Design a protein around this nucleic acid. Structure first.
Lengths: 58, 37, 175, 206, 142
RNA sequence: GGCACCUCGAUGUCGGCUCAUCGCAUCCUGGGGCUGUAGUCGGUCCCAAGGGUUGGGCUGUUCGCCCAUUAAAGCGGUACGCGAGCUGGGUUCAGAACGUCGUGAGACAGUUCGGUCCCUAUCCGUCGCGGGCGCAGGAAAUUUGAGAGGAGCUGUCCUUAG
RNA sequence: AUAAGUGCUGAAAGCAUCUAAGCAUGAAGCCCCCCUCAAGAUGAGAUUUCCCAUUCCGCAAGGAAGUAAGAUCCCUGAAAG
């Protein structure tokens, strides 16, 4: 799951560790690894989370 | 040539020099030139 | 006490030129020469003037600044006047002679030894017991001179073979 | 370079017109033919493929028949190729004969060596054998395998096996005599391979 | 449950120039791409990798004094004689072997490891044998 | 040699023969520095492991001394390399004997004569030779060369030149 | 192409300097040249030439059954074993 999330993040200008950090600060993302991979294979949702994480990271 | 791990200037005319990572002494007296190791 | 700082001259129509990337080419009366340098040193062509500047100040930069200045000066002088090195062999029957552009030496070796200058270097036999090499560039001239010396460097007992001009040679008693 | 393809007929001796006596090997080489001119631009290298001896139509298969059709000659039993020769010197299908060589030339000869069958270590690699007396039960065996620490036997220890049948080269042989009318070559010394075998003759590389 | 993809691989064809990128980082990253780790739908036993083509391998560069120091050893299992060659060599005559050995070390060892290595192609010059794969140039990241 | 950690429900010990193979701290050969190196010859040190590095007398002996040579007669590791490859001359059994010790049976890193060395190769490994299949048709030949293996050692004499 | 060695040029460090930038030379050593093996090199390579792309079935996934070139079985042997 970590590998898949890392690949998905790297393909959107964001490292895995920064993605997880950004999610945590953007809110308690009780959403987690396995269902995050399901979002990855529904990638548009994964991007819709990654953009929020990036925006809140700064 | 003397290959001694201790390299000294034997006579004032000798001069120590640093070459290819290893020090030598050049002296017009050929009896004194030496390299460490 | 800073060779890399001082300035060079253009005495008489010594065409100093700067190429695309810190590379130079001079066509003096004696001939033509070229040389390339790494880009750190900034050499600027100016009328009777050429600059020698190093960006920073530290070990390698200082060394190479000094070298490039000295090389530029040496090369411009060489292509202006041309330079020679003298070799004055010594021997009971040792012989120096010409064979056209080629050079042949007779020494205690049972057979003669030949040499083939090719880089615009020219040697002369001004006398049977003296040979002088002439050429534009110091590096090549000295290389040829050392090559001739290697044919027979002198011995410390009687002294023999090749001798650079005024080359003092160690003396050892022969009993 | 130059060379021809021939068959070893036998061995004899000949006097050299000096009082001395020369041992000589007798090789017959009916005029070879060049079948294919291998060239760099397509085959990656320059060479000529040539054939020496003839075959009956009963034994000549259709493939090699069509192959030789370009040279327009009888199907050739034995074929081999030489490198280092000048491509332009040889037309395809021209004959070589034997006058390309001449008496006095230095020559290197190669060919398959005589077979000898499954032979022991002594006969194969010529290493001494144990004492024949003093109770030695080690008459003709091939030596210890090796040390103990490696816990195996290294590659390349010499053991019994087959012999002969590998092409060998002899360097700097001399062509004593040539008889074009018979298509005959006479090489000083002796050459590998049994009688009536195939021998190939090449100008010495040295 | 996560989808273990199989028989749903679409292998892209990628090109990279190694003229100005050090072989260390180049290999370390191209190994990941060749393994397919970059793909979102990675699986560990299916070889989701992507074919890659190397270009101008002869113009690869080495840091430090490695050009004379790095020894490319090899031991044929015949008795105790080694064969060795330095790093700068093979720029001369066969630089694809440098990259092949480097990537070989990079990838995981195993049958599937050899299968992943099968998709690599290294050449001298700047011309592919093949253009029918619509390969697209892909510069590196690190 | 110190320790006793594996092996006493058994890991065969010296020397030789056969076969090697590795390290270089080099015996010769190759290339150099210095020399109290005139030259032929040397001494010391540096690079160098490609190859080579002998036959006999004595002794079980390796080791040694000796004879005659060679360019040299290298030093070590591999279970003080190698017994399911060999030898058994010695140590290490039972017989017997000399000296010595012991009241004595008997005992001596004191000596002497004699004294059974088992094995059909299963699996790795090594040297050869076959069959099967693959090489996106099936055949007959010729080949490229990745990559392996072998050789790769040297004297004497004439000349240069007394 | 190098090892040791000898170097030319030349600063660092107005000199000197085989060095840091450049350029050379230099061993029975290394890589070739010499000889042998070598496409199981699963990366199975190349070239020359021959056969041609039929008959049956679900029509087609793909099967089977006679053949082309060419081999084999079997037999006479050795230069091979």
């Amino acid at each position: 799951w970590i590998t898949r999330i890392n690949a998905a993040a790297r393909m959107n200008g964001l490292s895995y560790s920064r993605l997880m950090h950004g999610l945590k600060l953007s809110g308690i993302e009780v959403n987690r690894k396995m269902l995050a991979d399901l979002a990855v294979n529904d990638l548009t949702a994964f991007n819709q989370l990654a953009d929020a994480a990036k925006a809140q990271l700064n | 040539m003397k290959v001694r791990p201790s390299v000294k200037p034997i006579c004032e005319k000798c001069k120590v020099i640093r070459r290819k990572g290893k020090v030598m002494v050049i002296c017009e007296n050929p009896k004194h030139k030496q390299k460490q190791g | 006490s800073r060779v890399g700082k001082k300035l060079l001259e253009i005495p008489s129509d010594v065409t100093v030129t700067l190429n695309d990337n810190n590379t130079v080419a001079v066509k003096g009366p004696k001939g033509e020469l070229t040389r390339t340098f790494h880009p750190d040193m900034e050499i600027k062509v100016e009328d009777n003037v050429l600059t020698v500047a190093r960006p920073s100040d530290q070990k390698e930069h200082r060394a190479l600044h000094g070298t490039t200045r000295s090389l530029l000066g040496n090369m411009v002088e060489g292509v202006s006047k041309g330079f020679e090195r003298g070799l004055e062999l010594v021997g009971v029957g040792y012989r120096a002679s010409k064979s056209g552009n080629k050079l042949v030496l007779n020494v205690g070796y049972s057979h003669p030894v030949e040499i083939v200058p090719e880089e615009g270097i020219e040697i002369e036999v001004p006398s049977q017991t003296k040979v002088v090499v002439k050429g534009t560039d110091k590096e090549r001239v000295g290389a040829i001179a050392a090559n001739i010396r290697a044919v027979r460097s002198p011995e410390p007992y009687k002294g023999k073979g090749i001798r650079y001009e005024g080359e003092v040679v160690r003396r050892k008693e022969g009993k | 370079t130059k060379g021809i393809l021939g068959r070893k007929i036998g061995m004899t001796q000949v006097f050299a017109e000096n009082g001395d006596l020369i041992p000589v090997t007798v090789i017959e080489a009916a005029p070879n033919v060049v079948l294919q001119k291998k060239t760099a631009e397509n085959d990656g290298y320059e060479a000529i493929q040539l054939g020496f001896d003839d075959k009956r139509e009963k034994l000549s298969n259709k493939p090699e028949k069509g192959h030789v059709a370009k040279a327009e000659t009888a199907p050739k039993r034995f074929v081999k190729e030489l490198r280092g020769v000048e491509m332009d010197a040889y037309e395809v299908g021209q004959e070589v004969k034997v006058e390309i060589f001449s008496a006095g030339e230095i020559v290197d000869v190669t060919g398959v060596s005589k077979g000898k069958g499954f032979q022991g270590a002594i006969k194969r690699h010529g290493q001494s054998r144990g004492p024949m007396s003093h109770g030695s039960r080690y008459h003709r065996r091939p030596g210890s395998m090796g040390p103990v620490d490696p816990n195996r036997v290294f590659k390349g220890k010499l053991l019994p096996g087959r012999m002969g049948g590998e092409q060998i080269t002899v360097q700097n042989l001399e062509i004593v005599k040539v008889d074009a009318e018979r298509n005959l070559l006479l090489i000083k010394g002796n050459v590998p391979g049994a009688k009536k075998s195939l021998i190939t003759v090449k100008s010495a590389v040295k | 449950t996560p989808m273990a993809n199989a028989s749903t691989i679409e292998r892209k064809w990628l090109v990279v120039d190694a003229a100005g990128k050090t072989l260390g980082r180049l290999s370390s990253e191209v190994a990941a791409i060749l393994r397919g780790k970059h793909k979102p739908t990675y699986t560990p036993h299916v070889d989701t990798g992507d074919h890659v083509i190397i270009i101008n391998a002869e113009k690869i560069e080495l840091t430090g004094k490695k050009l004379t120091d790095k020894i490319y050893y090899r031991h044929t299992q015949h008795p105790g004689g080694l064969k060795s060659r330095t790093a700068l060599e093979m720029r001369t005559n066969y630089p694809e072997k440098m990259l092949e050995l480097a990537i070989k070390g990079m990838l995981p060892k195993g049958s599937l490891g050899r299968q992943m290595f099968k998709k690599l192609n290294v050449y001298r010059g700047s011309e592919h044998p093949h253009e029918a794969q619509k390969p697209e140039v892909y510069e590196l990241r690190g």
